[PDB]
Design a protein around this ligand. Structure first.
Ligand SMILES: [Fe+3]
Length: 818
């Protein structure tokens, strides 16, 4: 008696070579055990032929027939070993055993057998907490986790599947130059930081504490996502941009083939209209590269044309309105920093002995609050702020010592008008002062103006605010809070939860591509002299600023309701559907976010009880306890002393932790990521850097504000060359790959055999579709036009769950995937 099987696999890039003695599988019993309690193993069984009968295959997949000698006396197969005797690795999709069908979802690269210390093992798609593991599989389950953890030593190789932690000691390049040395981020009280995936390349020659450079920054093999279409390999684009395209742009500027600076706002608009003319060999260098070639239209000879950013598709001037500047604090790229202001003037916690008197210079009587007194505005909860004063002030002196960087620590006061829109009413541009200061520049307050030199000064004040906001968005809202904060949970999950584990199945879709993009980011984006440092204001101080901010990162404050309450933009109200009442009722990010949050909460609350009947079932789950202990004490270990970490001894705590992880990875990351080119593709709307402070009266620079305000603005913000690079990187990051897996989707319909879990997941997907219809109605509601569309007429679609491929300004992926 033989069991009929079907193996589906994808060749690395003909089929008969998989036959003969190329690939053997051995079934492993879940129910019948050897003398040591381990499931019995069948004979080596080779692929016998190509199956061309199976109608649904697609995706460059091939199917192979196989028949296993297996008596009922051997029990029910629950796992299998596979050995690849071919030289080249293949991608194993699945095994299916017929006549209830048994399904194995594998989705794993299988390298040549000689490269593996122990044989590759795959489990059938049943789901078990550890106390429910069929005994003959208990040791196999634990051994496979031991294999995944490795031993904390060694240089990781491409085919390794070893998950472990290290500090961010791989960003500096001190062996190339002392100027490229960077502080180790993580593992000290000076610089706390999330851990990242261990690579083990070993030390630089000049510094035992910094990891040597490498051509490839390892990730565990199945974290390195293949793509059927090379245009979908968006993560490789930053590498190409830093390594190939950036030097090509630089040469064009070095040879004076294009003007060095923008001279008018039209020179910026030209980038997406007629394009920019570049040297032939510069176009030729750029035009044939995968991913990069999708970023620009070209004549193939001299022109690159960027796509028209969403923010200018209806009005190219509306970004400069005060209405849009404020609206983007609730519905823009970075909609999560604004806070309620409940006293006046705003206060600082910084030491005046270091920075000088920190009293705000904004006077209440100077403000136009539409007829409200300050006491009325405070009491009616109509006063808000965008407060970068205490965040930036500690870094202003060192940033301003750089050539071509000058910033202020900014604070913007906002008033919620009776019509429900925000209006900006003052900007404070603060500088530190200490006795021995060389600079005579002073802090100042700038108020709104529509005419004259005062309008130029106000427009520049908004630019200094948005340089602070862009830096905070890129480093903190985006990099720290999503990419970096998530990676420790990815590592802990593979180290401690078996593929069989229900919480592994719940969480892992929300990790797709995260370790991969992070490793590529450590190599080319956040490295010394990398893309971020060379395009953003803080230069070599950028990543360490994120460490300072991480000192105040609180896991439980990443929950959306807790975030809203903490920032004073909502109050707890148990008479409301979400348990919070928004203080800005039409706050598009928050109002749409609450819907997505509630949908995820329902899903987690339905899934958890399928596997855990009482609080103890959580207390007695050994993998779960080890997982969470390690995630906290190792992964986020610099904050292990903090009192706010959930303990994980109850059903409530398990739901909370899973809910927060899924929210960060899916909707939070989407809302801060997919608006980058749509809003920031016009550099004047989202400047990444500022290069000079406000000019003094009686100077040429002051006269230029009067006579050529667009040039004054362009000389203040990001220069043309870093603009071309920053626009290219945010274009890649704002694109959805065509093989994305969105919230409410999974990569395989058979991820579990548990029908109740599958039903709950279908309900979750239906609810997300229901939510999308509701968000469409919100965008179509003329009463919500001021905040959901603004004068840019850009419907807020960033939290629509679904999307087609491309630069769509919508769609919530499961994971931090770009
Ligand atoms: Fe991202």
């Amino acid at each position: 008696h033989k069991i009929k099987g079907t193996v589906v696999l994808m060749p690395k890039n003909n089929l008969n070579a998989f036959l003969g003695r190329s690939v053997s599988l051995q079934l492993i019993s879940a129910t019948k055990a050897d003398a040591h309690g381990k499931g019995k193993v069948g004979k080596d069984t080779f692929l016998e032929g190509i199956n061309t009968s199976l109608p649904t295959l697609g995706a460059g997949e091939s199917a192979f027939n196989i028949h296993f000698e297996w008596d009922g006396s051997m029990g029910i197969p629950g796992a299998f070993y596979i050995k690849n005797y071919m030289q080249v690795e293949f991608f194993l999709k699945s095994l299916t055993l017929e006549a209830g069908t048994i399904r194995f979802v594998c989705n794993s690269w299988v390298y040549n057998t000689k490269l593996y210390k122990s044989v590759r093992i795959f489990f059938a798609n049943h789901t078990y907490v550890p106390s429910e593991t069929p005994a003959p599989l208990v040791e196999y389950r634990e051994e496979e986790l031991k294999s995944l953890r490795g031993n904390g030593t060694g240089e990781r190789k491409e085919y390794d599947r070893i998950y472990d932690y290290d500090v961010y000691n791989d960003l500096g390049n001190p062996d190339k130059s002392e100027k490229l040395a960077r502080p180790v981020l993580g593992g000290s009280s000076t610089f706390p930081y999330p851990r990242r995936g261990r690579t083990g390349r070993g030390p630089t020659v000049t510094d035992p504490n910094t990891e040597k450079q490498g051509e490839v920054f390892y990730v565990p093999r199945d974290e390195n996502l293949g793509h059927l279409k090379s245009k979908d390999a968006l993560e490789i684009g930053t590498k190409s941009l830093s390594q190939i395209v950036q030097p090509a742009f630089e040469s064009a500027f070095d040879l004076k083939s294009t003007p060095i600076e923008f001279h008018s706002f039209q020179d910026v608009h030209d980038l997406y209209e007629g394009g920019i003319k570049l040297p032939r060999d510069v176009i030729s260098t750029i035009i044939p590269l995968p991913v990069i070639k999708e970023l620009y239209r070209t004549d193939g000879q001299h022109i690159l044309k960027f796509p028209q950013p969403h923010v200018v598709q209806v009005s190219q001037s509306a970004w400069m309105t005060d209405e849009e500047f404020a609206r983007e604090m609730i519905a823009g790229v970075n909609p999560c920093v604004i806070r309620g202001l409940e006293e006046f003037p705003p206060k600082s916690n910084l030491d005046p002995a270091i920075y000088g008197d920190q009293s705000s210079k904004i006077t209440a009587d100077s403000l136009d609050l539409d007829g409200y007194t300050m006491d009325e505005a405070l009491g009616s909860r109509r006063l808000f702020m965008l407060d970068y004063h205490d965040i930036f002030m500690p870094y202003v002196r060192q940033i301003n010592q750089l050539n071509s960087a000058k910033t202020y620590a900014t604070r913007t006061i906002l008033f919620l008008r009776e019509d429900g829109t925000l209006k900006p009413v003052a900007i404070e541009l603060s500088l530190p002062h200490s006795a021995g200061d060389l600079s005579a520049a002073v802090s100042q307050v700038v108020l709104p103006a529509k005419e004259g030199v005062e309008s130029t000064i106000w427009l520049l004040a908004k630019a200094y605010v948005i340089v602070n906001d862009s830096c905070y968005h890129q480093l903190m809202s985006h990099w720290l809070n999503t990419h970096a904060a998530m990676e420790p949970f990815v590592i802990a999950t593979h180290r401690h939860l078996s593929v069989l584990h229900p919480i592994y199945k719940l969480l892992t879709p929300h990790y797709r591509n995260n370790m991969n993009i992070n490793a590529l980011a450590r190599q080319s984006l956040i490295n010394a002299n990398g893309i971020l440092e060379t395009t953003f204001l803080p230069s070599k101080y950028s990543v360490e600023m994120s460490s300072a901010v991480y000192k105040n990162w609180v896991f439980t404050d990443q929950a959306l309701p807790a975030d809203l309450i903490k920032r004073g933009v909502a109050i707890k109200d148990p008479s409301t559907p979400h348990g919070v009442r928004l203080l800005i009722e039409d706050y598009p990010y928050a109002a749409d976010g609450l819907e997505i949050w509630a949908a995820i909460k329902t899903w987690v609350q339905e899934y958890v009880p399928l596997y855990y009947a009482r609080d103890d079932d959580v207390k007695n789950d050994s993998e779960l306890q080890h997982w969470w202990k390690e995630a906290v004490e190792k992964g986020h270990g610099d904050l292990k002393d903090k009192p706010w970490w959930p303990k994980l001894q109850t059903l409530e705590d398990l739901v909370e932790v899973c809910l927060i992880i899924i929210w960060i990875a899916s909707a939070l990351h989407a809302a801060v990521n997919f608006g980058q080119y749509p809003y920031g593709g016009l550099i004047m709307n989202r400047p990444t850097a500022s290069r000079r402070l406000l000019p003094e009266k009686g100077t040429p620079e002051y006269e230029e504000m009067i006579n050529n305000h667009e040039k004054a603005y362009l000389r203040t913000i990001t220069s043309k060359l870093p603009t071309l690079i920053s626009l290219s990187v945010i274009e890649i990051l704002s694109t959805h790959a065509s093989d994305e897996v969105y919230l409410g989707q999974r990569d395989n319909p058979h991820w579990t055999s548990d029908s109740k879990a599958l039903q709950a997941f279908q309900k979750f997907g239906n609810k997300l579709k229901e939510i999308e219809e509701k968000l469409v109605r919100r965008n179509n509601d003329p009463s919500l036009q001021g905040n959901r569309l603004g004068p840019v007429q850009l419907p807020y679609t960033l939290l629509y769950p679904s999307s087609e491929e491309g630069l769509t300004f919508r769609g919530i992926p499961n994971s931090i995937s770009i």
